[PDB]
Amino acid sequence: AVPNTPKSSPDTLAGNRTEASAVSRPYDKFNVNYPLSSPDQARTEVTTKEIPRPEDLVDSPKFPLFGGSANGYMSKATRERHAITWTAKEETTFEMPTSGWAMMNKGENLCYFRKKEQCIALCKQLRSMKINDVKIYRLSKDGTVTFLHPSDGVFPEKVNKGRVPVNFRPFTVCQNAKQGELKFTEYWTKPYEADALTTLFVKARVAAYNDVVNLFPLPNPKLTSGPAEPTSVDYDALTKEAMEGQKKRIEAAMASV
Amino acid sequence: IDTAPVTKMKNLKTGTVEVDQTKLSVKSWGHMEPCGQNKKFQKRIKDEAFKLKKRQDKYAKGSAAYAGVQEVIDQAKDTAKAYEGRWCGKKDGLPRVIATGEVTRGGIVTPALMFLYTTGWIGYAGRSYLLRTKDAAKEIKIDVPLALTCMTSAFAWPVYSWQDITNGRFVAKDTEIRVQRMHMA
Amino acid sequence: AWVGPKKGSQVRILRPESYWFQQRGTVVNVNQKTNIKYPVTVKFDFVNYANVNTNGFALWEVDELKEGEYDPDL
Amino acid sequence: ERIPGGKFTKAQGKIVATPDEDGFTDSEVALALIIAAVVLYLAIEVTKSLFYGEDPETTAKGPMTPFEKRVVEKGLFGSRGDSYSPFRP
Amino acid sequence: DFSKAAFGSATGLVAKAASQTTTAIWNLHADAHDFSNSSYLSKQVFAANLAHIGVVFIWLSGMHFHGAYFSNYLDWLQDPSIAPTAQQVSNIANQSVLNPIRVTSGFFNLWLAEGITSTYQLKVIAAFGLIASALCFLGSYFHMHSSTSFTRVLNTKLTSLS
Amino acid sequence: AHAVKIYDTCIGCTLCVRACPTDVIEMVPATVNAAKQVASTPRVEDCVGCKRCETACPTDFLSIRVYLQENEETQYSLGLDLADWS
Amino acid sequence: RKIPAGPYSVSVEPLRDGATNEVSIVTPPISSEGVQEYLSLAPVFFMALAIFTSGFAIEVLRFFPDTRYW
Numbered sequence: 035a036v037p038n039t040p041k042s043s044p045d046t047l048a049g050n051r052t053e054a055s056a057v058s059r060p061y062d063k064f065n066v067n068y069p070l071s072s073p074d075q076a077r078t079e080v081t082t083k084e085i086p087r088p089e090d091l092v093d094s095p096k097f098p099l100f101g102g103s104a105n106g107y108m109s110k111a112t113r114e115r116h117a118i119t120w121t122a123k124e125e126t127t128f129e130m131p132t133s134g135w136a137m138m139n140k141g142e143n144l145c146y147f148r149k150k151e152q153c154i155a156l157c158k159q160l161r162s163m164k165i166n167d168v169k170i171y172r173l174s175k176d177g178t179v180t181f182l183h184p185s186d187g188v189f190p191e192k193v194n195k196g197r198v199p200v201n202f203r204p205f206t207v208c209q210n211a212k213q214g215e216l217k218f219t220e221y222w223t224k225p226y227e228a229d230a231l232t233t234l235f236v237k238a239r240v241a242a243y244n245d246v247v248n249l250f251p252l253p254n255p256k257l258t259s260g261p262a263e264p265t266s267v268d269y270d271a272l273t274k275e276a277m278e279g280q281k282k283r284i285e286a287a288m289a290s291v
Numbered sequence: 292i293d294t295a296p297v298t299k300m301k302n303l304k305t306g307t308v309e310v311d312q313t314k315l316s317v318k319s320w321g322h323m324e325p326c327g328q329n330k331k332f333q334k335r336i337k338d339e340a341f342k343l344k345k346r347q348d349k350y351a352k353g354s355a356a357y358a359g360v361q362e363v364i365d366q367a368k369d370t371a372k373a374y375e376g377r378w379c380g381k382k383d384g385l386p387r388v389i390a391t392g393e394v395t396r397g398g399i400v401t402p403a404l405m406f407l408y409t410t411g412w413i414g415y416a417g418r419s420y421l422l423r424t425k426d427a428a429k430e431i432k433i434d435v436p437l438a439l440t441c442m443t444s445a446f447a448w449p450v451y452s453w454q455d456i457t458n459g460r461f462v463a464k465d466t467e468i469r470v471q472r473m474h475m476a
Numbered sequence: 477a478w479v480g481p482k483k484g485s486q487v488r489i490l491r492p493e494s495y496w497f498q499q500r501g502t503v504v505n506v507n508q509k510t511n512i513k514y515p516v517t518v519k520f521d522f523v524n525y526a527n528v529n530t531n532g533f534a535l536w537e538v539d540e541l542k543e544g545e546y547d548p549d550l
Numbered sequence: 551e552r553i554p555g556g557k558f559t560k561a562q563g564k565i566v567a568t569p570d571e572d573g574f575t576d577s578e579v580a581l582a583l584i585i586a587a588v589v590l591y592l593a594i595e596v597t598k599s600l601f602y603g604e605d606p607e608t609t610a611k612g613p614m615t616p617f618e619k620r621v622v623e624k625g626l627f628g629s630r631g632d633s634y635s636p637f638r639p
Numbered sequence: 640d641f642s643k644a645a646f647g648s649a650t651g652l653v654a655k656a657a658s659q660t661t662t663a664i665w666n667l668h669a670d671a672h673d674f675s676n677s678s679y680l681s682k683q684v685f686a687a688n689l690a691h692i693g694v695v696f697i698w699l700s701g702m703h704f705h706g707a708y709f710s711n712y713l714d715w716l717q718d719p720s721i722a723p724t725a726q727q728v729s730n731i732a733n734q735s736v737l738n739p740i741r742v743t744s745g746f747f748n749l750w751l752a753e754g755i756t757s758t759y760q761l762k763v764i765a766a767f768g769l770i771a772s773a774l775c776f777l778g779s780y781f782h783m784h785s786s787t788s789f790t791r792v793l794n795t796k797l798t799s800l801s
Numbered sequence: 802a803h804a805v806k807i808y809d810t811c812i813g814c815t816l817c818v819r820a821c822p823t824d825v826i827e828m829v830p831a832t833v834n835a836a837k838q839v840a841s842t843p844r845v846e847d848c849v850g851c852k853r854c855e856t857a858c859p860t861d862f863l864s865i866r867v868y869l870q871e872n873e874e875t876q877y878s879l880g881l882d883l884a885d886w887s
Numbered sequence: 888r889k890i891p892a893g894p895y896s897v898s899v900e901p902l903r904d905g906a907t908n909e910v911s912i913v914t915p916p917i918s919s920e921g922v923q924e925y926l927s928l929a930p931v932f933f934m935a936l937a938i939f940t941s942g943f944a945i946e947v948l949r950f951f952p953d954t955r956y957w
């Protein structure tokens with residue numbers, strides 16, 4: 035129907051949603067292994083044949099007993115879909131994440147949602163009702179299906195092998211470098227993204243700055259085109275005595291620890 | 292066509308600032324006089340008495356309301372007689388509070404001492420209770436005998452507090468309390 | 477051998493960001509495994525803003541206190 | 551003619567005396583508009599310069615003036631620092 | 640036993656270290672009448688309603704008492720155009736200016752609509768209001784502590800209630 | 802994409818995993834805590850920023866930290882339901 | 888207590904045989920220790936302290952109106 039839904043296809047209404055997201059939001063990108071944490075993690079692949087896009091399913095037997103609601107996704111206005119594929123033991127009622135109530139099928143079940151949060155909420159509800167094998171998929175504009183939630187087959191609540199730690203920082207939260215210490219670096223506004231080596235280095239650097247009794251003057255550059263100023267201080271002798279001071283200070287510090 | 296009242300400054304080019312010692316007292320100030328002979332204060336008292344009498348006239352003689360307003364009138368008369376010793380300006384007639392530190396009629400030193408003693412009593416009673424009841428149970432559930440013991444025993448707060456301050460039992464060492472060092476000082 | 481504070485002994489927290497920093501807590505148990513970074517489990521009378529009063533600390537973040545060398549009045 | 555509002559306008563009796571002529575004629579207004587047009591052109595140039603920022607080659611390919619060389623060498627006029635501070639000394 | 644349980648909320652507040660915060664006190668106040676789902680929820684609700692009825696009866700008794708003793712109700716009967724005042728104000732501090740407070744609750748007109756002409760009738764109504772409040776408090780106690788569960792009144796006995 | 806980090810103080814509660822409404826946190830094996838498991842966030846792109854994971858972390862301070870990045874909002878981070886940017 | 892009755896109930900179990908001549912006192916089983924403990928609550932104790940202080944101030948204002956002795 036033309037008054038119920040726009041007459042044009044979702045792709046026509048989308049226009050250039052792609053090639054503009056890459057311009058409007060160049061930061062918005064997925065890592066090389068989105069559902070997983072390591073490249074060598076099986077990476078089970080599914081296609082549209084297994085989980086088809088919702089516009090290709092009409093009165094599917096795997097749909098639950100749902101009467102439709104205004105709270106579902108935006109057909110023809112959005113193209114991304116998230117699907118849940120869970121198998122029931124009996125036909126019971128459950129709350130849809132978009133409000134309203136549906137009744138599960140005896141066997142296979144399949145629901146479609148826009149946001150992954152709705153799918154995860156439904157998965158939490160189903161697992162609270164003693165349901166395993168709740169698989170959550172993502173449907174893209176072109177129909178590519180990405181398998182999510184139990185990405186490596188084991189639910190994230192349970193530790194499983196082959197899962198490399200991601201975004202793990204080997205220190206306490208307040209052991210991050212301060213923004214002033216990371217100034218003029220790529221991590222100035224994001225000190226939580228700095229390396230452990232970088233954070234330790236800058237935290238030692240700030241301490242080094244606060245020891246002007248042994249800090250080095252770092253002589254001025256020679257920018258003027260004229261001859262070098264004779265001055266009255268020998269930089270070579272200062273450098274040698276600073277080498278001696280650094281050696282003795284390091285020796286004493288290592289003796290302390 | 293005129294401006295605000297122009298005030299006259301002291302063109303003090305002499306190089307010295309003279310503070311008159313005889314002017315360091317309320318009785319020597321030319322802008323405040325005792326309420327007894329302040330014409331504006333007397334007019335205020337007369338207006339108050341007239342308003343009270345007018346309010347009284349509404350109720351018939353001998354009624355309870357008449358007696359109430361009569362007691363109000365007597366209270367106002369006694370208050371006026373007491374306030375005649377206060378200091379009240381020269382154009383307002385409202386008695387003033389002298390916070391210089393001179394012990395005068397309507398001063399601040401005696402009220403300050405009384406309040407400070409009373410509230411040091413309150414604070415020391417609370418602190419003593421918290422020190423002798425180091426327990427949230429006894430905080431939500433007041434130990435009434437111990438609470439009243441502390442309350443009536445805090446009368447010696449000014450001297451006990453100073454003894455604890457000088458003996459180190461009052462303040463806490465900064466290295467033994469929860470102090471904000473999240474910046475890793 | 478046992479490493480770390482003794483069980484049930486009061487310790488002062490040296491972790492600057494901890495809710496009980498420089499305060500005092502009772503050691504529940506110390507994990508006698510060298511790979512554990514924060515073995516010292518300390519219980520406090522005060523709960524933090526998360527309404528939890530038990531936390532694990534590193535060996536260098538707790539100062540064991542003798543039976544009478546601390547202040548009983550916190 | 552105005553309807554006076556406010557106690558002080560009535561009390562002080564200040565009158566808004568309109569000048570008989572205009573004051574700037576029309577030719578001088580045109581000259582002001584021309585100068586403002588030149589200022590607008592300069593403002594467009596400044597906006598284009600600031601929006602696209604400073605290109606990386608300038609201040610890197612253009613050698614510093616001897617004044618700038620000596621100032622950076624000796625650390626003067628806000629150099630040897632990371633601040634602007636127009637009221638430096 | 641019952642007196643021990645009267646401060647049972649405070650005892651539970653101090654029992655756990657997690658509830659030894661002022662936030663626990665504010666929660667104790669906020670969750671005061673939030674009667675949790677249980678076998679005695681309907682008893683609790685009905686007893687609370689009856690206690691509130693007793694409170695309102697206390698209020699009505701106080702209003703009739705003020706009409707009887709601290710009001711110019713008889714003078715208003717003799718002349719309705721006068722200001723209805725039913726709250727005397729004692730001479731403390733300096734508040735004597737507002738001693739007759741013109742009450743605007745309409746109790747004088749209500750009592751005249753009820754045929755009340757003597758302050759003795761207002762005294763009797765205040766006394767009977769106190770008696771009714773006492774009876775409501777007794778009934779609320781009884782229902783909270785010794786009566787039927789009342790769980791059938793909204794689903795099963797809704798026809799009888801309505 | 803709101804960056805979410807895990808620190809050494811994590812003790813393998815799995816509460817942060819159960820509190821995530823978008824399956825961001827994930828339990829990896831590790832040899833730093835007695836639980837021999839540590840949270841990880843390999844799907845930060847799904848993090849809305851609700852900080853439910855921080856509400857469920859029992860450590861003295863948050864072993865899992867959600868750093869909101871308002872200059873890098875995403876339809877997954879903004880929780881868009883009626884607008885698609887893919 | 889098979890019949891669902893609230894906690895702290897002075898009600899006899901409604902599952903009784905033929906009419907019983909029994910004593911079932913409907914009065915709260917309160918305790919003097921419990922009553923004293925309740926009146927020692929921080930809300931009760933501090934509201935009583937506030938009432939006492941307010942009344943003391945009231946009486947001082949009544950018998951010594953205004954600050955006549957300033």
Ligand code: CLA
Nearest residue numbers: 413414415416417418419420421433437438439441442933
């Ligand atoms: C044992 C009780 C006690 C004691 C000794 C203190 C002592 C202090 N408080 Mg304090 N306070 C208290 C209770 C107490 N407070 C309570 C209950 C509150 C919550 C309202 C506060 C809120 C508070 C704030 C917001 C501030 C202080 C500040 C201060 C300091 C300056 C004095 C001041 O401004 O007081 C003023 C006191 C108040 C404004 C609140 C008083 C409320 C009542 C009167 C106190 C309770 C007394 C206690 C119940 C007695 C019971 C005894 C009985 C159990 C035996 C001082 C260390 C200030 C500070 O840090 O300065 C350095 C400050 O900014 N307090």
Ligand code: CLA
Nearest residue numbers: 665666667668669670671672673674675676684687688691
């Ligand atoms: C028949 C009337 C009635 C009844 C029986 C209830 C009953 C209930 N309401 Mg409710 N409510 C009502 C009317 C009513 N409400 C109305 C008219 C509103 C709109 C204003 C609300 C708004 C409301 C909210 C928003 C909430 C409730 C909640 C609740 C539950 C817990 C209440 C509680 O613990 O409060 C304890 C008692 C108090 C907090 C009273 C404190 C005093 C109040 C806050 C201000 C009074 C100021 C006073 C008038 C002025 C002082 C005098 C001045 C001169 C100083 C309970 C089932 C809460 C709940 O979770 O329900 C499950 C909840 O969150 N109600």
Ligand code: CLA
Nearest residue numbers: 698701702705706724725726737740741742743744745746
């Ligand atoms: C000590 C203070 C005090 C007390 C105890 C009372 C007590 C009473 N007044 Mg009263 N009154 C007072 C001060 C007081 N009043 C003041 C200062 C005025 C202004 C002149 C009035 C004006 C007034 C009128 C006009 C009437 C009463 C009535 C009543 C009776 C009804 C019970 C009641 O108030 O319901 C309890 C209600 C509340 C506690 C408040 C309900 C919410 C209010 C209406 C909203 C506004 C709150 C507040 C007024 C605004 C300021 C609050 C805060 C900012 C300070 C009762 C005896 C009525 C009556 O029939 O008397 C026999 C009546 O008609 N009073």
Ligand SMILES: CC1=C(/C=C/C(C)=C/C=C/C(C)=C/C=C/C=C(C)/C=C/C=C(C)/C=C/C2=C(C)CCCC2(C)C)C(C)(C)CCC1
Nearest residue numbers: 580581583584586587588589590591592593594596597600
């Ligand atoms: C009549 C005439 C004419 C014409 C005229 C005209 C038309 C004129 C115009 C004029 C104009 C039209 C003017 C305008 C102006 C404007 C301006 C002048 C502006 C400015 C601004 C500024 C200056 C600022 C800027 C900025 C900003 C805001 C941001 C960025 C940065 C900057 C700072 C740059 C002609 C020639 C024909 C003839 C003669 C006369």
Ligand code: SF4
Nearest residue numbers: 811812814815817858
């Ligand atoms: S809740 Fe905190 S401590 Fe527990 S596993 Fe998650 S991040 Fe680690």
